[PDB]
Design a protein around this ligand. Structure first.
Ligand SMILES: C[C@H]1O[C@H](O[C@H]2[C@H](O)[C@@H](O)[C@@H](O[C@H]3[C@H](O)[C@@H](O)[C@H](O)O[C@@H]3CO)O[C@@H]2CO)[C@H](O)[C@@H](O)[C@@H]1N[C@H]1C=C(CO)[C@@H](O)[C@H](O)[C@H]1O
Ligand SMILES: C[C@H]1O[C@H](O[C@H]2[C@H](O)[C@@H](O)[C@@H](O[C@H]3[C@H](O)[C@@H](O)[C@H](O)O[C@@H]3CO)O[C@@H]2CO)[C@H](O)[C@@H](O)[C@@H]1N[C@H]1C=C(CO)[C@@H](O)[C@H](O)[C@H]1O
Ligand SMILES: [Ca+2]
Ligand SMILES: [Ca+2]
Ligand SMILES: [Mg+2]
Ligand SMILES: [Mg+2]
Ligand SMILES: [Mg+2]
Ligand SMILES: [Mg+2]
Lengths: 569, 570
């Protein structure tokens, strides 16, 4: 008789799907994805075996950074719909059993926000809402104004913008139009609680928290009443206006940012205690080194932060250049450094990075989806990974990404532009791939949508989507929710991942990540007794689901991945 | 129940290899210089310690500019160390005691006082192209203003190119001006390297530690329009054109051709072992390089076979007193993740080029580090002094002799470059110069702490570093350490485990608190550990003694505290 397992809180082993609403589904023929479109396809998440959806920003926004420049944190961007459409989405998602998280952008507001307009005007209570600074005293040329410091924006050029009206500089770590809040202002910290409480009370199940490494910068009180310069890098390819010119010592990962995150979690815990129902959660976005990433969870003094910080390792440290030993060594980093009791999470893609099968190879999609689903903890899926969408082609003309428009020309833009990972979702082989009834989509529909689309993959005997479905379903098994893991490379080309749990079925990934065939001794795989049955295979595997592995010698093709189901240990 | 037979491994696959620094081991004759008679007189020390194999830093004829890594005759003994007869007696007594003996082979470069160089500089036939000789770079801006062939920078500071007034050409030195780089594209150089190894194997050497292999080969001018191509600049503004770090060594280090020489050396050594029989003769390579470039020393995808192993310097390069237990796990896993299947793992905690293990880490971590070294799968490497927890010796500017410090250093900075602190004489006892010498005039000053830290004190007192070391080398005879699986994970930011297990044989568990703070851990999390278990070894500061019974699954470990537990078979 198999052991009983204690059920986990929903967020500890959810499949979390990141919707990019502008590119998911257009219900209204403007070539722009919208909330009624998402509502019309909430059944997709259930069919997929997704537990939770996180939307990129849907709040009022001048759309300079497609939603990450928010002018009203309390209302819905008209192009996506209304507050009424948002409440309908929560009702219908909840009725289907889905959790819904919103994208909370605490570092900055649009310069078209009431916060900024009032702060620029020095309205009482808003004067010190953002980071405002006098020019650097220039004794040599009192004639030429100097920025407060050399700090560089993520989207190109000075992080300091002159306001004619206020006769001071404001800080922008992102676009000129994205003004940084003063997180040493208690009125700001209170507004962040107000915003989250507002959406929790509407019924959101939590938040994805944007750009947290950038919350807090050096206090000029600590540097004799000036903003201290960031150290220079030396990289001769970067001039004083180019991102990479500085080391962000005074502008990123300040220890004081984590106190804000712990205060958010305290607020959220108290909210959950006072409301009951499903735990509401925060998942943080932070590209940082391992030490500074893990501090999001909490610290050695018992502080508790985000339910988890996102694990970007499959984006930052793995690619088509990676061999099987790289795959193992990077997988092991989160599992080795994550604090005791922390929930691991795996992210293969997002709206800021190239699509999974473009970073890796077309023949690796199933293997990567299996890694996502079979590792312990939380699987994160970016819109399109479930059908193996590829980066779309976007001309300089069709490019709308502020980062490309700031840092690029028609020769260089592709190095900066996030648009190719933002192309409309492939539903079917109809006009604009079933994304819109209109041919004029906000970004161009990738050329391969006739070949790569959801309806094709539901019709055909073997597909990325059917593999995705079999894997989300496997996550219900006690072996994946509660099982141990063992992971090692068998060669430069192939590794195993074994989930095992006494009295429950053993599950094994074998994945040849290389461009060459590989033959391995399955005798080296712990907890694998043969015969074993193929549960899932790569769409071009010689092995079908149900096929029996009896021989201890296994030849994998380039890209080939198998999940084997073997007898319990 | 009954314990499975294991097939016994070839000696080199699980040896304890001890690196002797001859100049600082034992002075037999009162000149304050360690010598071969000194070594012979303490070969019993290796048997006592449980050392299987000794490797000596260089003992060949040398002007001593780089204390023997500058070799003027590859076929004879440095006079201060002794004679060939002393070397033959060392090999004979070491072998009688069952010890294997390796020699430090320095194939990258020869002394500028070598016959090879004097004949090469004079363009003697057969020697003209023994070294990398290059004309000055043509200077079209001002013709005949002398420019070096390239921007290449020496490992010991300044240009890697030295002007010969006699030959009117530059020669290459990746190391000291006195260390002249051989041309590894000259078949006559490659022949000479087999001649040297054949000579010392014929004397009965059990193999070699190969020096500085990443630097063997540099860019061929024939591939760069007949010049030596500049190495790419770094940008790091603390580094000027004459300072190491100013360049990225793209055309001067880790060239793929170097590995072809290594594989030819292995092919010769396999042929020699096959023709002479007796104990396998081995090569262990020294290469500070990235993981990809390091692992190619074992062999390559085409099936070529290289060094028996490249040294694993991860406990020198990537761990220190700044490391937590998660850093310890993640770095230990790097070699085991990246090493090719069939490869023998190895663990180096120190050498004569780095700060001593207790100085890099902390004085209360010595036993924990020696346990790691002995309990990880494969080969344990010990540097002279680590078996008694020797700390770095104080060495003044005035007493500093390391060429790296004399070239790159000044009175205020010498401490940044000098390797001398890790080369101070070995602490035998609390007699004059710690029993290293009967003379108080030692070639480097004896460390101030020898009264506190010496072999004899540690052999007499009930608990010591050396007693722990003995217990750990004895444990390596156990099937579980030779043949067992491993499992390693961090229980906290402070404490990790390493479990060696093998069905029907005892289970051994390291628990190590690498932090400066007490940690409490749940032993229930430790795989293959059933309580009660017996403490087999403890840190000298541990409240637990060998023979102590662990019964509680809750375990408090003090800062630096390590335990090896002996648990029932799985
Ligand atoms: C847009 C995004 O920008 C920042 O993150 C950037 C890194 O700063 C940048 O270095 C780069 O990181 C790559 C790294 O250079 C490379 O060596 C490694 O192999 O891979 C890394 C990842 O590709 O790109 C990342 C993004 O992928 C911030 O840290 C993020 O906060 C930020 N994302 C947020 C913030 C904003 C502003 O509101 C939005 O524009 C964005 O869409 C949102 O998700
Ligand atoms: C002396 C030794 O020099 C070279 O190795 C050096 C590295 O080049 C140097 O960068 C440094 O590496 C450290 C690295 O900087 C640091 O960030 C990392 O954390 O720690 C590294 C190790 O401390 O130090 C190493 C030396 O420890 C060569 O690669 C070696 O081949 C060379 N040793 C050989 C060669 C010679 C010349 O014959 C002898 O002088 C030396 O005694 C011998 O062992
Ligand atoms: Ca900020
Ligand atoms: Ca060389
Ligand atoms: Mg629309
Ligand atoms: Mg002597
Ligand atoms: Mg050094
Ligand atoms: Mg196991």
């Amino acid at each position: 008789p198999p052991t009983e397992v204690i059920q986990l809180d929903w967020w500890k082993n959810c499949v979390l799907y990141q919707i990019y609403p502008r590119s998911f589904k257009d219900s209204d023929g403007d070539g722009i994805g919208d909330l009624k479109g998402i509502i019309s396809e909430l059944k997709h998440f259930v069919d997929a075996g997704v537990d939770a959806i996180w939307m990129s920003p849907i709040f009022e926004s001048p759309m300079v950074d497609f939603g990450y420049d928010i002018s009203n944190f309390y209302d819905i961007h008209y192009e996506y719909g209304t507050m009424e459409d948002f409440e309908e989405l929560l009702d219908k998602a909840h009725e289907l059993g889905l959790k819904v998280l919103l994208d909370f952008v605490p570092n900055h507001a649009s310069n078209e926000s009431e916060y900024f307009i009032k702060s620029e005007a020095r309205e009482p209570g808003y004067e010190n809402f953002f980071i405002w600074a006098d020019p650097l005293p220039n004794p040599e040329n009192p004639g030429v104004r100097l920025p407060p410091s050399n700090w560089v924006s993520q989207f190109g050029g000075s992080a300091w913008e002159w306001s004619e009206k206020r006769q001071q500089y404001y800080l922008h770590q992102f676009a000129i139009q994205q003004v940084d809040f003063d997180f040493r202002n208690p009125a700001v910290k209170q507004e962040m609680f107000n915003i989250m409480k507002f959406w929790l009370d509407k019924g959101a199940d939590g938040f994805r928290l944007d750009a947290l490494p950038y919350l807090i910068e050096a206090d000029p009180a600590d540097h004799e009443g000036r903003y201290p310069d960031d150290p220079l890098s030396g990289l001769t390819q970067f001039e004083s206006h180019q991102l990479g010119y500085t080391i962000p010592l005074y502008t990123k990962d300040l220890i004081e940012l984590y106190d804000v995150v712990y205060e958010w979690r305290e607020f959220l815990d108290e909210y959950n205690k006072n409301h009951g129902g499903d735990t509401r959660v925060v998942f943080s976005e932070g590209y940082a080194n391992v030490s500074m990433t893990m501090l999001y969870y909490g610290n050695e003094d018992g502080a508790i932060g985000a339910h988890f910080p996102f694990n970007f390792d499959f984006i930052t440290d793995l690619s088509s250049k990676s061999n099987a030993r790289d795959f193992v060594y990077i997988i092991l980093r989160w599992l080795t450094y994550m604090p005791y009791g922390g929930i691991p999470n795996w992210v293969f893609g997002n709206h800021d990075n190239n699509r999974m099968p473009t970073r890796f190879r077309h023949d690796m999609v199933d293997g990567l989806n299996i890694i996502n689903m079979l590792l312990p903890g939380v699987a994160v899926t970016y819109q399109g990974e479930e059908i193996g969408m590829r980066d779309g082609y976007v001309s300089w003309e069709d490019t709308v990404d502020i980062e490309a428009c700031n840092r690029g020309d028609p020769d260089t833009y592709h190095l900066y532009s996030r648009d190719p990972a933002r192309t409309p979702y492939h539903w079917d082989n109809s006009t604009s791939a079933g994304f819109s009834t209109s041919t004029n989509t906000w970004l161009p529909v990738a050329e391969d949508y006739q070949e790569i689309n959801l309806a094709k993959q539901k019709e055909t005997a073997r597909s990325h989507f059917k593999n995705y479905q079999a894997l989300t379903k496997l996550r219900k098994q006690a072996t994946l929710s509660h099982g141990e893991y063992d992971i090692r490379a068998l060669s430069d080309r192939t590794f195993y991942l074994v989930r095992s749990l006494p009295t429950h079925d053993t599950y094994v990934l074998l994945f040849n990540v290389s461009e060459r065939r590989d033959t391995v001794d399955l005798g080296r795989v712990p907890h694998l007794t043969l015969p074993a049955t193929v549960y899932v295979s790569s769409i071009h595997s010689a092995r079908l689901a149900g096929h029996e592995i009896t021989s201890s010698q296994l030849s994998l093709e380039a890209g080939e991945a198998l999940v084997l189901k073997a007898q319990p240990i």
